[PDB]
From a paper:
Micrographs were collected on a Titan Krios electron microscope equipped with a Gatan K2 Summit detector. A 3D EM map of apo-form hASIC1aΔC was reconstructed to an overall resolution of 3.56 Å. In the transmembrane domain (TMD) of hASIC1aΔC, two transmembrane helices, TM1 and TM2, are observed to connect to the β1 and β12 strands of the palm domain at a juncture called the ‘wrist’. Residues Gly444, Ala445, and Ser446 adopt a nonhelical conformation, dividing TM2 into segments TM2a and TM2b. Overall, the three copies of TM1, TM2a and TM2b define a cavernous, threefold symmetric pore of the hASIC1a channel, in which TM2 resides on the periphery of the pore. The apo-hASIC1aΔC structure at pH 8.0 is observed to have high similarity with the resting-state structure of cASIC1 at pH 8.0. The two structures can be well superimposed with a root-mean-square deviation (RMSD) of 0.88 Å over 1124 aligned Cα atoms. In the acidic pocket, the distances between the Cα atoms of Asp347-Glu238 and Asp351-Asp237 in hASIC1aΔC are measured to be 13.9 and 15.6 Å, respectively, which are comparable to the distances measured in the cASIC1 channel (13.0 Å for Asp346-Glu239 and 15.0 Å for Asp350-Asp238). Our structure shows that hASIC1aΔC has all the hallmarks of resting-state cASIC1, including the expanded acidic pocket, the extended GAS belt and a closed gate. Combining this information with the electrophysiology data, we conclude that the structure of hASIC1aΔC reported here represents the resting state of hASIC1a.
Acid-sensing ion channels (ASICs) are a group of voltage-independent proton-gated cation channels belonging to the degenerin/epithelial sodium channel (DEG/ENaC) superfamily. The trimeric hASIC1aΔC shows a canonical chalice-like architecture. The ECD resembles a hand-like architecture with the palm, knuckle, finger and thumb domains clenching a ‘ball’ of β strands.
Residue numbers in the entry:
A (entry chain A), B (entry chain C), C (entry chain B): 40 to 465
The structure:
């Protein structure tokens, strides 16, 4: 034909192109794509994070008695299974002799034992480890820190925001407008390490973690180190992420009491302590010292057959047992370390006078932490939906309004034209 | 009805859905959303940044006279308010005696005093602090650095691009294709610190800031530290941000002389020095030593009642006095430190010969900075408008072209159909 | 007129606005814009990277013979061009005397020489440099590392995934769930440095690079340093980038044998070694020791006129000779260093016994690397097309369906209406 032969390709080919192009805007929508948004909103009064710091030594050597070596001798790796110093050939010169009159057990008649009570008196004490800190020039106290427990032993927490005291805030950047702690890691009272184990440690420092205040401390997997004899400027940078709920991303939404069995808030580091507690109470009824709840802590004899082999199974065979993902409102904290050597020539003769110690002791034990904010900004890393439902109806309609010019009314008009087909002319 | 009863829901319900969906594409536009764009454009000849480095000690102790302790004795924290060494019990062994015959003032008849003139001769000198630097193997001079002033005292600047000399460029990554400075922090000439103040400092190092060349140095809030006895590889990474003007984001746009009262360009660190100058000249007519302009610097007696308490008020009560935000064309510089111990066994006997100093002095005072580019890239972090006006008319039209099929012509055709209503049939 | 005079502005002005708005959605498409997508997908079993570590000293001083000083004396900077120790006034006390009876050449009759054979026996040996490493507690061997060659001399590689052994994987974060190497940098056997050159080095440490396993080691431009006497916790963070092919970005797509002349895979660091090989074999037929292929390595006499001046020309005059960009599937590795001082008071008397060395030697030569993953995540930084072709036809049609209401059918209906013009009425 002349008029109708051209429309066999025109109206049908444009319809054939439309079904290819209308699908790739509907197949695109069900991917649930999302793009991000980095911003840098300045502020004037930023809150302070929660520093958590503890020594790299769990137990003070000068504060273990003849009772504690009896029950926990396999735990400290100071005795064998037969209760003896395991052939310490050329160990030391004096530190044998403190154990030579404490590892006797000659008809000892041992007292009852506790495990949390062992951590509290034989850990390092912040009344002696700390010398003088500050906060914007205003002085500290030892009562500003709080005793927390984790795998490294007794650890402390500054600005935790727990048990009544509120949270502290900075109003300036700089270096002297944050913490200036002056610790003393006490290398005289370390555990003697003349033996050898796979878990042995040679170092001597302090593990610090800077986290938000809505999390428990998670020192063993998130903390950095700070060397003695150095002043370390830990600059910070507050980041506020905003994630997306499924099917876009993966985020358990925030609520009042979401998935709380032993805590109140919800966090990633608040969840592996939850899943490593319910597994231990249900397997052999233990509870390690850092786990929350009211279940009784178990003996160090149970520590070799319930602590290590059961918590090996959460990373060996039962990695599908519990799973938990990021909350939708995080707050991270970046860090940019840099070190400056602390005991200068001018200060070697004053610090030796003030704390009554040798100049050799000062260069090997004094450690100045220094935490601040770099500039008073905070970055936001959001996740925004790339293709909403209200934008799908636009681009699916603008193609139909281009190729055939038919609206959603006229397709129903053809559907009522088939009603004119069925009985009016048939 | 049969034909018209169905259109009471068809034409009206699709219009009812349209007003919900056309609003959420107009309410979306007035949020002014924006998404970002990270790119990594390789290059071949990148410019070099502007290193700014100075000691952690403001005044050399062996270069203060009996005049300078008279006027600035409260400033250096070496005298009391009654002009005496404040009970330095067991201070030192020799460093008392330099002050025992300089803190006399027995009918001294004091000369006139200046404050910038005190900084220039009693600060640390780069002719003696610097030993030998390099740039791509080609040797330095002491005349490549420039004297600048900030809160830490006299500080120097490499590759500043000021007073005629052009900017230097790198053509390779590596470690030996940048600065290799060998400083000497001079711990023999530090200030004696047998006293105690809140502002006291024990450390001994060097504060470096790597910034762009369109900014003044802002050492006290943006600089890291470098320890003596270590060689620190400061790797860099050039970033070029592009921000957005309001109402999308917050950015004063770039111009020729934007908001310049004492500078020429515009920057964030070039603005707080501006706002801390206009406040000080209008309150008690002072000018601290690091502030630009022609107003006269004031005496250290005015330093206790105008420098510290007035600049306390900009972070206490008048945080709304001046505000200034990011320019739209920044250039940052990342950094990734790492340290290697400098005085090796092979070099302990050569450096002791060449600079005529003991092996104890070399391990406590020699410091090798090493700044380079890691790879010759630069990242761009742009901010792009998510929903322009030209895309609003598409998605607002494709919905109307879908639900009712009415264009902007036919709504005016109905508006002229009401003209046919008003007088042709009424 | 009354009806037709209004349509001179209505139908024509809306058409006039349409050509401005339809262009800025077609001019927008040909920019090929793209936005990014940061995600954080958690995992459970992440692969381990490939550590590459070597000393900062190329040649052991106690293992160069009287033959090697004859041919390579200009290379090591130990002799002059006239084969003599160049006036070493007050050099040392003993280390002259090893060279005083080795730099004789009194009728030496020199043997034939090789250059790769010189690197293999006079480099540092991992059987003596390494003391004890670990991997998740399970012990190492010296046979887990692999000899590779680069510009720093003989370097080693852990977890390379080459020559049959598979790749190792972690299942936990923490600090003791990665490498814990205990190196010994051997400062007794360093080269004597009483001379002076522009390329001279004072430091003594170890350069480590953490890279993926699809790259050759590129130590001299991508490695950080690790100081002796310190234990450095190198935390990691696996990133998986996805780039875009042109015209959006710049990326040679991944294939089986893309641009491989001496390698198998494709990478950025695998390409500059390619371009620095083809240039050297075609200019003066050399091959430096770190270049792959079968071309013969050339003498150190050729090293002064072919190694340095020809490889100066790739960064001076022929920077357009070869160019190669990022592959579309990278894998980077971030790092966050932190140091803890290693030889504690408890371990000073045990390490002195176990490895039979003085306490002075332990604090100056023992170095504990510690590499782990922080948390078992991996970040994805994708680049997504901002404006596809299927979205162009939507927003270009929704504007035409708004302003004039004309589809692509009716513009062809007017084009056939001109066929009714040409001969039916003319
Ligand atoms: C006769 C011709 C003109 C056919 C034109 C029909 C269109 C109007 C259809 C085809 C594809 C349909 C869409 C296909 C898929 C979806 C996903 C669907 O997703 C949901 O959100 C439902 C599930 C939930 O509520 O989570 C919402 C309706 C929508 C947009 C549909 C709306 C109507 C569309 C655009
Ligand atoms: C009779 C029926 C078919 C109603 C259809 C009317 C539409 C054509 C109207 C409804 C919403 C209007 C929009 C509402 C808001 C804006 C924001 C406005 O924003 C500005 O940029 C103005 C201020 C400035 O210049 O900065 C520009 C016009 C526009 C897109 C309007 C264009 C015309 C729209 C799409
Ligand atoms: C009579 C009136 C209504 C004019 C309306 C015509 C439109 C339907 C035209 C004008 C601009 C044209 C576009 C101009 C440019 C391109 C780029 C072109 O880019 C390619 O991808 C081709 C090359 C390749 O395959 O890589 C694809 C067709 C397209 C979208 C065209 C599709 C049809 C458009 C939208
Ligand atoms: C995240 O949202 C919750 C409630 O939705 C709110 O209480 C909390 O303050 C928010 N946190 C941040 C950092 O925005
Ligand atoms: C200072 O230290 C010495 C040695 O430890 C000790 O004998 C002396 O009592 C100490 N003095 C004070 C005041 O603590
Ligand atoms: C930013 O823009 C100004 C002018 O708009 C220009 O002079 C300057 O070079 C730009 N800087 C960058 C880093 O793009
Ligand atoms: C080297 O130092 C000593 C002690 O400081 C000094 O007496 C001697 O003059 C110095 N020699 C030179 C050449 O500077
Ligand atoms: C990148 O893509 C190639 C093939 O396209 C694939 O073999 C490789 O595993 C991918 N790598 C990553 C990190 O996705
Ligand atoms: C220990 O070192 C000394 C001195 O280097 C050496 O004489 C002795 O033979 C060494 N002993 C062993 C067992 O290696
Ligand atoms: Na659209």
């Amino acid at each position: 034909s002349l008029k109708r032969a051209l429309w066999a390709l025109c109206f049908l080919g444009s319809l054939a192109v439309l079904l290819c192009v209308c699908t790739e805007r509907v197949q695109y929508y069900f991917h649930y794509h999302h793009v991000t948004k980095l911003d840098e909103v300045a502020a004037s009064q930023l809150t302070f994070p929660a520093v958590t710091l503890c020594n790299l030594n769990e137990f003070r050597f000068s504060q273990v008695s003849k009772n504690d070596l009896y029950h926990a001798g396999e735990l400290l790796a100071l005795l064998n299974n037969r209760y003896e110093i395991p052939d310490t050939q050329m160990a030391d010169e004096k530190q044998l002799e403190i154990l030579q009159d404490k590892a006797n057990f000659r008809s000892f008649k041992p007292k009852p034992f506790n495990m949390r009570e062992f951590y509290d008196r034989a850990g390092h004490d912040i009344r002696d480890m700390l010398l003088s800190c500050h906060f914007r020039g205003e002085v500290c106290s030892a009562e500003d820190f709080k005793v927390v427990f984790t795998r490294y032993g007794k650890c402390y927490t500054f600005n935790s925001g727990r048990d009544g005291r509120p949270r502290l805030k900075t109003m300036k950047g700089g270096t002297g407008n944050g913490l200036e702690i002056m610790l003393d890691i006490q290398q005289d009272e370390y555990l003697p390490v003349w033996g050898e184990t796979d878990e042995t440690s040679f170092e001597a420092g302090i593990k610090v973690q800077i986290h938000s205040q809505d999390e428990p401390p998670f020192i063993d997997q998130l903390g950095f180190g700070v060397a003695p004899g150095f002043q370390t400027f830990v600059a910070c940078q507050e980041q506020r992420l905003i994630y997306l709920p499924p099917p876009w991303g993966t985020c358990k939404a925030v609520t009042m009491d979401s998935d709380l069995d032993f805590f109140d808030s919800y966090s990633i580091t608040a969840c592996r302590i939850d899943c490593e507690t319910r597994y231990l109470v249900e397997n052999c009824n233990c509870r390690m010292v850092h786990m929350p709840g009211d279940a009784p802590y178990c003996t160090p004899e149970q520590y070799k057959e319930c602590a290590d082999p059961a918590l090996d199974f959460l990373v060996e065979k039962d990695q599908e047992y519990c799973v938990c993902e990021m909350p939708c409102n995080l707050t991270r904290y970046g860090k940019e370390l840099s070190m400056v050597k602390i005991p200068s020539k001018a200060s070697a003769k004053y610090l030796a006078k003030k704390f009554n110690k040798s100049e050799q002791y000062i260069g090997e034990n004094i450690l100045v932490l220094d935490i601040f904010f770099e500039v008073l900004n905070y970055e936001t890393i959001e996740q925004k939906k790339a293709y909403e439902i209200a934008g799908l109806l636009g681009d699916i309609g603008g193609q139909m309004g281009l190729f055939i010019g038919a609206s959603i009314l006229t397709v129903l008009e053809l559907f009522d034209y088939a009603y004119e087909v069925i009985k009016h002319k048939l």
